[PDB]
Subunit: 470 residues, 4 copies
Amino acid sequence: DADLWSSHDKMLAQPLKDSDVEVYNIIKKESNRQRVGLELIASENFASRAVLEALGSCLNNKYSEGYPGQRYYGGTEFIDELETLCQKRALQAYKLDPQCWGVNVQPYSGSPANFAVYTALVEPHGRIMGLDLPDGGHLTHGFMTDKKKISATSIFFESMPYKVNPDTGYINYDQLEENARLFHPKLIIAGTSCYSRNLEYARLRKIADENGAYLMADMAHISGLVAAGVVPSPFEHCHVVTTTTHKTLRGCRAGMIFYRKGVKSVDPKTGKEILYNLESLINSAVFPGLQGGPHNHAIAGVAVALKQAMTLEFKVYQHQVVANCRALSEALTELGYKIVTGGSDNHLILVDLRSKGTDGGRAEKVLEACSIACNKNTCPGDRSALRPSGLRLGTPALTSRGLLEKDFQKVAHFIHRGIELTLQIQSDTGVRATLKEFKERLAGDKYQAAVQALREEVESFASLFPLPGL
Amino acid sequence: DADLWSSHDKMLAQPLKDSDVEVYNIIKKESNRQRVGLELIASENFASRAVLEALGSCLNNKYSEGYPGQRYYGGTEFIDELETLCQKRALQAYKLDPQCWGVNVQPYSGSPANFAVYTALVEPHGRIMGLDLPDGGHLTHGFMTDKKKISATSIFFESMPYKVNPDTGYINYDQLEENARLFHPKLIIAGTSCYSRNLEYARLRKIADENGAYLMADMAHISGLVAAGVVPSPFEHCHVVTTTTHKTLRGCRAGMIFYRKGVKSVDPKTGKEILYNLESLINSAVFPGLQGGPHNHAIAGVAVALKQAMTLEFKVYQHQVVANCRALSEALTELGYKIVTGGSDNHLILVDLRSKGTDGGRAEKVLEACSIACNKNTCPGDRSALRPSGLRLGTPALTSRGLLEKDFQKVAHFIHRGIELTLQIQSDTGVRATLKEFKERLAGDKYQAAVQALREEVESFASLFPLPGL
Amino acid sequence: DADLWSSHDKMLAQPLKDSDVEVYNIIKKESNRQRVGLELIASENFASRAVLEALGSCLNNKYSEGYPGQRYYGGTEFIDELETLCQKRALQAYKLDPQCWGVNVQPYSGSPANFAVYTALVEPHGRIMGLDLPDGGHLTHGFMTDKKKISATSIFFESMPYKVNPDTGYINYDQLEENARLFHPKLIIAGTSCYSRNLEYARLRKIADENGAYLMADMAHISGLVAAGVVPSPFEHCHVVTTTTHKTLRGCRAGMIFYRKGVKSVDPKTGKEILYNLESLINSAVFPGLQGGPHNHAIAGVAVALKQAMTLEFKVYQHQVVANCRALSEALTELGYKIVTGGSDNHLILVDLRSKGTDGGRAEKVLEACSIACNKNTCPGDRSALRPSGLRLGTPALTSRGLLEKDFQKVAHFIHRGIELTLQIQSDTGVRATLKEFKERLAGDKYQAAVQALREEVESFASLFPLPGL
Amino acid sequence: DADLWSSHDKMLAQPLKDSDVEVYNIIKKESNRQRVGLELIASENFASRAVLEALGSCLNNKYSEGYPGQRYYGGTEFIDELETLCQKRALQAYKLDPQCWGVNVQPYSGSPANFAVYTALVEPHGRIMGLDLPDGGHLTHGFMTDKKKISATSIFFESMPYKVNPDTGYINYDQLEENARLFHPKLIIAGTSCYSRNLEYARLRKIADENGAYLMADMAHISGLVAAGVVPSPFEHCHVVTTTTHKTLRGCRAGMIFYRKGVKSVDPKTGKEILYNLESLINSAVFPGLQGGPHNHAIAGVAVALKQAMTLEFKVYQHQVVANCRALSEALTELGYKIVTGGSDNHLILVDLRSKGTDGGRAEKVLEACSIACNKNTCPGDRSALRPSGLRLGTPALTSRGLLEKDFQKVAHFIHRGIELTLQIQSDTGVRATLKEFKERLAGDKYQAAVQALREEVESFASLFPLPGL
């Protein structure tokens, strides 16, 4: 008889290297690329090998729609031990009284986390106020132009941004407090994806209370810092805290929603009092509202990343983050670079390349060709969103490998040497000023020797450190 | 000096069993539970070991917002080789002319896939028509009661269901065609999560064209079947096809959106013609619209699951699915069970337990106690959504281990023996008819010997087969 | 000195005939046209001379925003005596316990009345179900095509019609009850603008209660009948009753909103009970919500028309309406005309001209040329909305002049003689079948003698009766 | 035989004084009240006797749904001569090229006019920016609080106000231009109901063009002035002009919508160009969109008021308006009253009563008791919307009777004598400061002699002048 049926059995147990060498090559190619690169993209990091194991496990198989104690099909006994162990670890990592804070750990990624909160607390066409995109706010905090609403947050809800003060570089809280009285937010977003300094959660809570609006923090970018205490915690001031489980938390791609439960209103003559109904609203928006079967294999990685974040090693790792950040920010500042806002209270800095006579658009694509990766970003006071003059560098990714202040100064010198190239390639184009032309001149032969020269040096340096996972 | 810094290095490379035995135990506990259980939940399956490896890899680290050729930060060269290799494999698996079909492989799961399509083609408060929930339609096809809109699809959009014909059990296409003229859909959903038989995509396309509405298929539940050709393909009739990359595709949790590109309108006297603009609309809804950083580690698993689906072994596996399904449906039908619609053209069957004098609510929770898992489900003509009289069993999960027609008949006998228990525990409660009471009587001591008796037998049987992954 | 200032004084007190003969001519031209015409347009009537006087009075001058006891500027003492005298007369005309019914008399016309109710009880995008336009429902009950939402009710709210049964001609309540469970109305409209028979308010209330939706009647077309008791009253079954103050109420153009106040819910174990909050919601939607300064001069006319409606003369006038209607419907039925539904329980009838081999489109424009005016209307079972085969005739307008059953039979003979012409002009066009061609052939010379012949006869008849107002 | 049928005939032709003396008394009571009162309410006026005649005429009877050339039932031949004669007169009154301006004259009142424009150009939830309510903007320009959206404009659309500068009293155009870039208006409202000075339509058009938003003027309050040229015309800068046909136009309660037709875009290399499609959108929103049967009797009055506005007498009447306004504003300013903004360029002034130590709330209700009527109004820089410290006086109403600068100075002295009373009644209450208490103390006996003293004097003065209409 024709028995490829015992072969089909083999295919399900065949290892990756054998089943599909094509993606096995793509993976081991990327693994190499990561190890020979100085990763300065602020939102990057290298996930623990304990997280990567839990990620791909038989946990991938169980559908477990619902929540513990409200599952829908029989089999959710060990997936229940997990989801409650995970959200239990979360509430510990940030030292929250479980009777004052609940958490939902099902959101698929960060953006899906934020959107679920709006669905649960704002309702369609409710007004939302977040930091403007070019001033350092994430897409899901609202983004829309004269012509079209671009971010889903702006499509299904009515958003209006509040901006940073271009003279100082800090959030303009006075103008927010003022415009809020004209816009009437229902929920204010206290979060950023490219802000050097701390948020005045204390003052944002006052603005939200005066307008009758929820205050939700999007600590995705500083979740790791907040957890180690290296940055003041948004929990004592916010009604809801959304977070990405990666970036500075070194977990797998996922997201969580912290929501205060307990008592909300006083009523000093009514006797009885109001209570936070955030638990039911948020959980009902995640499911049956927006998602389906939770990614139990992702909750596993989040659970182990949360334990890893409550360690002592993790505490000092985050302190090195902020230290390596200022160590870098200082080195560039000494070299004559304008660091937006003057410095940083967290893991990233926005350097305004107009102090050296270039823009982040051209500088980004030349550093990349040298195996040091980052991203452009508009600066407070930028004259056009098309020629952004800023680069956003962050430590967490590199410092996760072992880099120290001493080392990050070498990283700042390599960076500068990259800008030295950008200025040269820009002087050649000069009069003929077009990104397509600049993009080509670099790929041209004249500089293909100079870029290779700096590229050899940066990779020889990056190779000296470890790379968690492989 | 205090050097826990070389220890922090160790923590990132420490294996799961050592870093966090607590979740390592939870995982190896679940792995065992899966192997000793007869999994009949229609939407389940066991993922390939090649998929589980690609899942947890260094691919987890790279943020790659955008698409190939429209990334935003430097580093997306190997993530580009992947995303285009993946969507290339997709278009092959279903044998679609790339010049007539595009695909987007970033959606986080199934539900996020569907919602992205509505955002891109329907816009807020546009009307949508999907199969009713209790008649076999997924939550994201629209669900709302007199009181509150429950599914996000029904919150941000205006939905109205079309129902199955309770006398036959088949979709009532005549009533759909009729009500559509009163409701004016903008998009009709041709998909199910609990339907025994095939969809008349041919006729649903006619209804949509007569009302000027997109026709989108949600083949999540039969993606594996459609790909092996064991069930007619919705691609020759639909404008968009959303799909879950698991269930009958045996991949990791993720989702895809197939969209027709090319030429839409004729204009036999205008000369020039209209073109499908679905590519830009759908891609712009996924990003920058609803999602953020794609889960490149999930696209890896989808890529290897797509190659695995184009094999010959996969083709015969799906044929065994449909065969084991009728082999089971027949056995129960012979035993006197009412199989809704009479049988099945795909991998699952809805059996109406009113033919044996019980309901799926009580039967579900007793089979689960016997280590054979499934889920209740309302039947065409059910008198109340609280006492659902149907169970939804599907082969794909078990047949993925090696079960054959011969074996599935043994699975049908074990099942029946479960209903024999349900009827007994129900006769004791009898007059005193409450689920809480029935739930307790089973956990009681009288039957805790009888359940254990049948449980030993079902686990001894399930243990005889493999379990892909470990 | 140049004193055109005592002349400006004259201009404000100059009579119409002197100030602007151009509109004085237009008015006295129309006055004549009305007197020499057999007015059968169902929604027409001739306003009392006591209403027309109150209409144009110094009441036009006072701005009186708000309500009695909630005005905003000083001066509303006599405008208050009016608005409360008016709404007092309203509640009497329909014999409603003021402690169970409130009324708002500010709405500018009928349509503005209806829209205010939706704004107050439904809120944006709440679902509404009204009789379909071509089946005899007013525009403001919802109207929208595949392409665009046309009626404001359908733009700001989500509407879906319920249809008449083409085999019988009556509202298909069984299908409404059924579809309502799929659509989930929030407010059901029990009103028509072209329906021969009575509404089953009793049954529409049951459908609304089963779906949790308000039931509002739009008795604009039978307000006069309901008030005289010649047709069952929608007040014992509806939550809200909107009405036009003209048509069968013989008032000036305006509108009112009747709303039940009092107790709504029971709670046979809670003790306390819910109360109808319709008064505040409706009044707050009219103002400060949708309108501004009330038209106090229109409320004056409504007040005198309400007193006129509570007379004995008004009671018999309405009885003659229903009598003259059947007297006419019978005459045509005897002549071989298909009267939709068989007859009428109210003041109008829809005659299906397909029984004589023509359509209302061509018949309308020929009767008009003969000085008998009416309007086309689609019939239950019409094959295209472009060639409507129905005419809608109503008595109230003509019977308001003095016509009796005897006379209305002469009106039915004149009408038929009009259709005799339509058939001739249609046979000439025959093969070449186009409305533009038919429209021309009538204006042509061949028939311009035959139309004038019948026109002389109809005007000689219409001139014999009075014309209230001049 | 019982013939009350010839009596019913009498009732329709019975005069008002006989049919319903109750409203005949209410009318002749109000007529008297108007003649013995100094009317300073800014939005008031006395309608011409030629307008009041046309108002109540047989024109009330004809239903004429649609527009000229798009009516729906036969009979609209003289109603067509009117509606096109009327809109023809409109386009003349403001000297607009008919090929560059269309007009719609059906809107029922002012508010219904504005709302129709939003429906036609903005669509639901499109953003609108109007002058804030307390800063001198009408309700329909948008009004909403933290808690509830109050104005229909704010319910169905998303509005955000722009404010007056409290230090100067003028509109803060710099802040508008700035916030507009954050809010992204779709339509900016250049109109006021309580603004002393002229609008910078020139600058508001620039702000709207920079944001891609329509600029619509709401000249309801200065329609009469604009028409006589006593105030710069918004037509050379706006896309749409809505207007009330009363207030300074001395017509009957109604409204109009001016909309530019012609060519909108350039395309200096495309050749062909875009065209203003405002005509179809606006007309389709009025009908079949929001309204029903036009009030042909109101269009008649508007037509005669438009002819009356194109006279020479009307031109000088408006010049006397602005003259009597400054004559009054000057007199109070000399007396030590703070006139908001310093003076007025139009027919009204906002006087800030804090310069005399009182508030408009208490002053309004005492002047009313003295037969001089006006309304309170918040002042730029008011500390609470509950104790508004401003009164809004306007000339047009009184000057319409014959008052001159000389006379208006006597009106300013009477006014002051009213504030002298308010201060006394306020000193008695003093410590015990409550409006209910102040309201009572005035109605009390102590001052009922002093109020009567000033009341005799003001009525003896007001009686000396005419009163158009009776």
